[PDB]
Swiss-Prot record, chain A:
It is found in: Nucleus, Nucleolus. It comes from the Eukaryota. InterPro entries: U3_snoRNA-assocProt_15_C, WD40/YVTN_repeat-like_dom_sf, WD40_repeat_CS, WD40_repeat_dom_sf, WD40_rpt. Involved in nucleolar processing of pre-18S ribosomal RNA. Required for optimal pre-ribosomal RNA transcription by RNA polymerase I together with a subset of U3 proteins required for transcription (t-UTPs). Interacts with snoRNA U3. Interacts with MPP10. Component of the ribosomal small subunit (SSU) processome composed of at least 40 protein subunits and snoRNA U3. In the absence of snoRNA3, forms a complex with other t-UTPs. This complex can associate with pre-18S ribosomal RNAs. Present with 358 molecules/cell in log phase SD medium. PROSITE patterns: WD_REPEATS_1, WD_REPEATS_2, WD_REPEATS_REGION. This is U3 small nucleolar RNA-associated protein 15. Keywords: Nucleus, Repeat, Ribonucleoprotein, Ribosome biogenesis, rRNA processing, Transcription, WD repeat. One of its GO terms (cellular component) is nucleoplasm. The gene is UTP15.
Swiss-Prot record, chain B:
This is U3 small nucleolar RNA-associated protein 18. One of its GO terms (biological process) is endonucleolytic cleavage in ITS1 to separate SSU-rRNA from 5.8S rRNA and LSU-rRNA from tricistronic rRNA transcript (SSU-rRNA, 5.8S rRNA, LSU-rRNA). It is found in: Nucleus, Nucleolus. It comes from Saccharomyces cerevisiae (strain ATCC 204508 / S288c) (Baker's yeast). Present with 9570 molecules/cell in log phase SD medium. WD repeats lie at residues 8-47, 52-89, 218-259, 268-309, 315-348.
Curated annotation (Swiss-Prot), chain D:
This is U3 small nucleolar RNA-associated protein 5. Belongs to the UTP5 family. The gene is UTP5. WD repeats lie at residues 12-43, 44-83, 171-210, 212-247, 319-351, 389-429. Its main location: nucleus. Keywords: Nucleus, Repeat, Ribonucleoprotein, Ribosome biogenesis, rRNA processing, Transcription, WD repeat. Coiled coil: none annotated. Interacts with snoRNA U3. Interacts with MPP10. Component of the ribosomal small subunit (SSU) processome composed of at least 40 protein subunits and snoRNA U3. In the absence of snoRNA3, forms a complex with other t-UTPs. This complex can associate with pre-18S ribosomal RNAs. Involved in nucleolar processing of pre-18S ribosomal RNA. Required for optimal pre-ribosomal RNA transcription by RNA polymerase I together with a subset of U3 proteins required for transcription (t-UTPs).
UniProtKB/Swiss-Prot annotation, chain E:
It is found in: Nucleus, Nucleolus. This is NET1-associated nuclear protein 1. Keywords: Nucleus, Repeat, Ribonucleoprotein, Ribosome biogenesis, rRNA processing, Transcription, WD repeat. The keyword Transcription applies. One of its GO terms (molecular function) is RNA binding. The chain holds residues 300 to 847 of 896 of the full protein. It comes from Saccharomyces cerevisiae (strain ATCC 204508 / S288c). GO terms for cellular component: 90S preribosome; nucleolus; nucleoplasm; peroxisome; rDNA heterochromatin; small-subunit processome; t-UTP complex. Present with 6560 molecules/cell in log phase SD medium. Interacts with snoRNA U3. Interacts with MPP10. Component of the ribosomal small subunit (SSU) processome composed of at least 40 protein subunits and snoRNA U3. In the absence of snoRNA3, forms a complex with other t-UTPs. This complex can associate with pre-18S ribosomal RNAs. One of its GO terms (biological process) is positive regulation of transcription by RNA polymerase I. WD repeats lie at residues 1-35, 191-243, 253-296, 306-346. The keyword Coiled coil does not apply. Involved in nucleolar processing of pre-18S ribosomal RNA. Required for optimal pre-ribosomal RNA transcription by RNA polymerase I together with a subset of U3 proteins required for transcription (t-UTPs).
Amino acid sequence: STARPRIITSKAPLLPQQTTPEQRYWRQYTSAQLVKEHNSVTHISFNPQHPHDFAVTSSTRVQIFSSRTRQVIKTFSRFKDVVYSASFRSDGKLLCAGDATGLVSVYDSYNPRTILLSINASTHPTHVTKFHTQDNKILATASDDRVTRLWDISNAYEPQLELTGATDYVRTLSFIPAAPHLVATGSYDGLIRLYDTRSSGSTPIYSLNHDQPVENVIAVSPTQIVSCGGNNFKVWDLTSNKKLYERGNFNKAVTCLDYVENFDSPMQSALIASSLDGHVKVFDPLDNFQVKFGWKFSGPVLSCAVSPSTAQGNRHLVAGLSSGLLAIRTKKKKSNNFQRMMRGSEYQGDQEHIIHNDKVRSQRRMRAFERNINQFKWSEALDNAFVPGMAKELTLTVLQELRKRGKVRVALYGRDESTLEPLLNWCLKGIEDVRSASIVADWVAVVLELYGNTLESSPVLQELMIDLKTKVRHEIHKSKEAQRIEGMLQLLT
Amino acid sequence: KDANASHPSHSAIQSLSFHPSKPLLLTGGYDKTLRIYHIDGKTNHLVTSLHLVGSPIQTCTFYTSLSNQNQQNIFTAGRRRYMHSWDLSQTAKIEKFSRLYGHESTQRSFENFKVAHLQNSQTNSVHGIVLLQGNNGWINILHSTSGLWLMGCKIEGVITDFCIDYQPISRGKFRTILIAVNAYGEVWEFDLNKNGHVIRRWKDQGGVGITKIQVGGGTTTTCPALQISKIKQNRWLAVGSESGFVNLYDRNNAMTSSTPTPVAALDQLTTTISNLQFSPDGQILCMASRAVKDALRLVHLPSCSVFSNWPTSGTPLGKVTSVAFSPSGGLLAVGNEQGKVRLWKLNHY
Amino acid sequence: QYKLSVVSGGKPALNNLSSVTGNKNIARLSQDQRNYIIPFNNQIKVYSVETRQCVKTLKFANNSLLSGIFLQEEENNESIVKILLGDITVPQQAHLITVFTNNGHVIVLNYKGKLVESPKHFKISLADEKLANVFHSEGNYRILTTFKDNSLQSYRLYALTFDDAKKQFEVAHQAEWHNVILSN
Amino acid sequence: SPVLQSAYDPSGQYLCYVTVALDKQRVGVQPTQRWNENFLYLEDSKLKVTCLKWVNDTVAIILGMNNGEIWLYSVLANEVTYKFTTGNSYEIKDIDLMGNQLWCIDSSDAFYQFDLLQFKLLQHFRINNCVQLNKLTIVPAGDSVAQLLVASHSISLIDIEEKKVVMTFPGHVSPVSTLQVITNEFFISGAEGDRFLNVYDIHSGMTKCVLVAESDIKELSHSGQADSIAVTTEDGSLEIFVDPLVSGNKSKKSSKKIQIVSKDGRKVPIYNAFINKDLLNVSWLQNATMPYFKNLQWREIPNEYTVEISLNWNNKNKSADRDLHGKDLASATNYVEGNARVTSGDNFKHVTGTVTVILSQALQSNDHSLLETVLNNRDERVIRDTIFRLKPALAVILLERLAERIARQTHRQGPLNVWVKWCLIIHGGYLVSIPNLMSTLSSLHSTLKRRSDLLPRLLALDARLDCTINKFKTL
Amino acid sequence: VLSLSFSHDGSYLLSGGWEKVMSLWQLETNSQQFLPRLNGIIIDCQVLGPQGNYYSLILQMTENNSNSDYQFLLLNASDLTSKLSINGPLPVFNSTIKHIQQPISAMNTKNSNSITSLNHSKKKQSRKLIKSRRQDFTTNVEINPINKNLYFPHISAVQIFDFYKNEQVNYQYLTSGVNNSMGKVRFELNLQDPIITDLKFTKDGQWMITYEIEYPPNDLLSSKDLTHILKFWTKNDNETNWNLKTKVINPHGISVPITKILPSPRSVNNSQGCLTADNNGGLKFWSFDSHESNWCLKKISLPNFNHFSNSVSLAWSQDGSLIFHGFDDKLQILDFDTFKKFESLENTKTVSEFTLDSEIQTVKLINDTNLIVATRTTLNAINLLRGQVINSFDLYPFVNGVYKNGHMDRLITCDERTGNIALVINQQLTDVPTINYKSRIIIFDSDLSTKLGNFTHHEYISWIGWNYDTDFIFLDIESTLGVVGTNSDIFAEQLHKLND
RNA sequence: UGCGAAAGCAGUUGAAGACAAGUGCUUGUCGUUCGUUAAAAUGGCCU
């Protein structure tokens, strides 16, 4: 024997721009909600360790939002002027926040009332305050004083080591994964400067030019750093000290940048870049930085971040917007006597000599049109095909394979005006489209060649055939011109 | 020594069986797993296990065909729509009778069945039949080497059990009769040789709610024949109620009179009779109850008197779920809800 | 150097040149129901039933006598009419076969052994008409032979036995029918 | 163990084993050198086999029986050919035979000599000092069977023709199990529950050696000139001592040790090996009683060998006709399509008030909102002047976006048609420059070729619609 | 109704139609339980055990209108499961072989016979093959090279079949049709399933590519146009179910038959590409996009020749430099890098355009060195070291109209180390031709001048290919695959055999 | 039916015989023979 073949639903050849896989996943990220804020938010930082929370600054206010409840949790608001960068530590314990008066405070996250260690940096503002990732206890801060410092958070009376040699307004710095002692810095004059810190550090080990003012720098490997400023961005191979790539498909300047690896996705790695136009566009370094997906948040955008690679919960994508707006898009994730009476059911055969399963495994259920064509009632197959909410593919399927069985007249004998009419309405839509014009031509051709006199008798079928006439003429017009353009193009080639 | 001792079951024993020729035992439960033990006295070892996946068991039967004496099978069944047939050195030959032919609405589950021989009578060829209960009165009879439907007998009311008893006629001739007990008590006796036609019907006296009928004293589905010359007609009939009573008739006089008196009416157990087996030579009736602990009694027949000193207070029995009697060695093998079978020898044999 | 030979054979060649009778199968199960005998167009294969493989082939190409009988390529028309299991010349010595072709040849062969180059071949004479079927209860064997003088054939029914000599076949007329459209 | 007793025959081809079955013992013989349902049941449940011996003129075996009898059983016809009796009823502790003389130690501590061919109880005695008795061996004294050994817990040698005990060697603490004459002069006793075998001399009457075994001993077979001793160790193991009779050198350990083990590591217990010159034939019980054998060659076996058997411990039931899964091997399969990529054969991939500033922004980026609004603008003078003001490379990318949009929305084809037409008209020259025009403009090429394929059926159907409309319109 | 057969007791009856179900009627209540699909009409059914254990039943495979495709079945009775299925090699010839008719039905359609039509059509076929000399019985066979399994494309389904074991191993449906979902009976029998016309293996072994044309049912608006389909299938070497990995609708655009397929040599993409060649003349080149995971065009060549020729043959240089594309009366040599013809910059008569006398049936290359052309009248041999013709041979004696266009391509192939094989076919007569047949094979060396072998066959030969163990296999009418190549022991017997 | 491309272009529908129906007469049928390139019976797919 043989099992019965299921019907192959009719898949016509693909049209351009098909639902790409990456698009499937990133468009899962949905269910957006907005939060109004007091002022243009600046930096966002997901807590690394138990990644369920994220900090987001404001004017004079660092907020800790939650992740599983997407609401506020905690508020740090003891800052004199507006506060510029907030970032959790490696281990997750501490939050460091630098404000424009020129002082930083590191204090125990999820404990807003212990200003635990206040380090006074330069009297110029300190735009960037980050904790070292590889070590856990050196706070590398920046300033607007064109000089960045590595403080030790044990003793904060003197910058333990300093990095200088700037030109103008350092506002980005970063570290590198496999190297512990390399610090990368980005100013506003191109010129990423890579410092060793095992030497005096006053001079860079080497600089990487970037003609236009950089604004973010991310180590994305032990060997590549992505530099983000002005209209485009550029990724540098670091040992060989040369730029591999440069992608610039934005409009205004990019602002912020983030890179996340090894989350459950068809994309192994992703790099999301954010560009002050609503445009947050997401790229990937295993397909050579070709653009994959994009959201258009309304205003200009200052920051973006996706929740880290160890989220284990509903992941998030937040973007913080220059008129004071957060937009968040989140992807979610009897009797004891009775049992002792009937206690075998969960054995699954561990210590037995032979194991024999032959149970049939259940298919999915069959639709009504497949049931009628399993059991040969063609007339009700076609009537049960023309359903109100039924997929255009499915109506094309039953029309196709009923014709393939070669029972068009047979599927059509019994009919009258009312048993016909919904077919004509669908044939209107079918001739309107292009994948189905062949098959509906077959079906309406036989309706005519079989039912002309009834068509004389009733008045409403006249209405349908007049209207179908005008429709199909206008379809002559649309393939008509479409052949003329083939002439056009063939001359230009 | 305990028959399971070597490979302990994971659910209650539901149905035991001794092989009609060799020294084997078969056990099965909702554990889904047939286990065939070689039976010694000292050691009881595993010949074989088999785990039929996704399918329970609530009845196992060894089956040795009577003409061939090589067609040895095991039939197993649970609350499913199919029966498995394992035939009897390294991998298993198992079929599944699955399709009843015109008519399955009369049975949608295969869990209650028996096997028994039958003669064609136009040629003296003897084949299996498989008897299955059904929806309202229906017993469906299938041929057993090829799953075909033979004949179907409706008793009224609801069925509750059915036995088989054979009659001999001449050398080369027997005749099998199917006995079906309504749960109000009205016994119907069809015969199967000519198509299933009602020989008689008589009422069990008393008997408000009946579970379990069984015959004994001759050749049955619990001590079967091994060549046509050995088929013997069963002398005793027993009918066991779900109050607890068990009426006991003699076959000679019940067949003659066709609304007879029970020879003896036993009431010792107090819960619902769920097993009735006779001894293979037909002198002990063991009547047992699934429902409370330690409810086996062994009855000596013809005098219809319960043996008073075994089972005692300390007999480790538990909620007895199945019982067998051995064909030759005089062994008794009992299995309960913990899943442990225990084994005794009636030393007289 | 270069060798042309036959390796793989095909068709089973159902009993079609009948074009009349309604039991077209020739291939026969054993007595011990363990192996199936299929008469192929250029061999006979013995299939073990329970292991679903071919446990033996019997090639007319390898046997010198069988190629002389069947594969005389000018007339293929020697074609198997019936297979019978237990050997006819001996009452119950087994594993042998007697093969009946279209033109009254009976061949005594074996399987589960070795086809030693001496098949016991006997020929039925007396037949200007054609063998159609050979079939039997115990002892007495019956022969149908297609026959002619509407474009339809005639059937002749013969009784057949042995022991006269080792090559002698008793055939006696029993019945006949004139223009047969169907027969089963 | 389920096998109560066993013995090989001489020349090691047929094993006789006796085992119980619903409590009626049965004996049964098997081949081992490459079946037998020719069993022998005992009838009563009260007589048990107590000794076995083969004798080489059918092959027959002798069952010393618990009744007090000695059965002689031809193996071929399952027939107990003859039952000699002692005069009494006590369980025959031992049986031995050499030639034609059968001796049995009765549990009346008594010696019986029977004659086989004569079938007659010849003689009948008891001697002093042999207090209880358990085992017996009559010596190879040539042809004459004089001066045989019998053992209680302590061995003793007795002389027949004067029926007097001649010698006595220190036995064991437990009763002796095994007792064999290994050479002309040496013989081994070995005692039950002891891991020890003593090797005595007959004439000097002192221990030549002791052989230990790593666990308790259960059976013993020995090779030709005492060159090899294969001892079945009751843990289920097999020790062979190689050449135990030559020269710290009193207690010899065992040379080579053989275990048997299934694939998944489970131990399996050997019982009753048999040895000869370079050919050891071990045994084990495969299924619950059925015995399976194996030959192997121990001179070249390594020192500790774990011979392996495949034992279908948890395997998954495959049927021959059935597939890997559900299907059966006379099924054609089915046309499964699933997730194949289905595509055409023309896929030529891989082979004055304008808006031009907004348009060129959107096209250098990819702003579908912005392309949206600019394509929403519709009037054709605006269209033509805009496309003219555009830079031409960006107009190529305009064609790309336009084509994708037509194909996905073939109801937009009018306005997007005027866009693509005017674009082509104005910027034609750059397109003449570009080399791989088709490999760029696949999408436009694909869309237009599709509709151009479609035309003629539409025309034929238009004719047929005209036919019917004229037919009922004229009347 | 084609088979009726009782059980033994006479209470069950098995029935047997075109409708491929096998029906058991139980007679006491006229009830039944069939066996819905079976691969073909059942021409006999029977109950064979003692107690009705097995039903054997011979069934016809009637789709193939070119042979007699029986299949023996032995159904285990309890389970209704096939305890044995027995079969031969099943090719599809061009048109019908010697006096083989079709079964009987209600109507006479293009698949069966009415009664009247049965008698008449038997007369017709006998007369046709006596009279008209045009006849050919040429078939398509592929060899899976890693497995050396003969793949016979039966229509709409492949029959994987090795020949060492002779055990027909699989039968796979390769086109959505009505293949199993039904059994056709009358006007349903007048329907038609899409035909596997061509099948080729990449030299890798992991990929086959197949070409199969789709027919529409008659009397429609679109009862004129066929739709041709290419498909790319894969498998691991362990699995037996070929998987579909790319379905291509309409290669070369609408209504144009891909009438020559060439798998690629290993150099170009580790043998993962193919040429498809039309009848107008067009060429396309598909290969495996590996950053994606599927197949695509990579190189095209569309020449608008207004004319059609259904005889195109082609071959590929082993280094992959160039492509011989022989077409009607013509041969063009093409640069692989361009899909444009290779220009004679020497101008030393090493031209790329050889014009030959008749149509072109076959173009091959024994090495890089010799090219070999079979033309409708003659066999030509040219060497490409220096561009001169080497040898010619007369075939118009034997090849007149005896074959259709291209079937000589499937008659003759070449071993790719040593030599070449040619195949000739005759029918016998005394005084008008009979229906007997006889062929002869000839093996030539690479020079195409010396005959390394001249052998005879007593019945018609249909196809030759070279088994990759440097030998050749050839098929037949009578479906045989022929090869061209180079106290103790007395005691023993008893135990081994062992009313009142 | 032959050639051919997927187009299409060429070409073909003969006698005999017997039987049946109506009534020697009218028509038909064919498990018939020569001669050329020569719709139907309420009936549909297992678990």
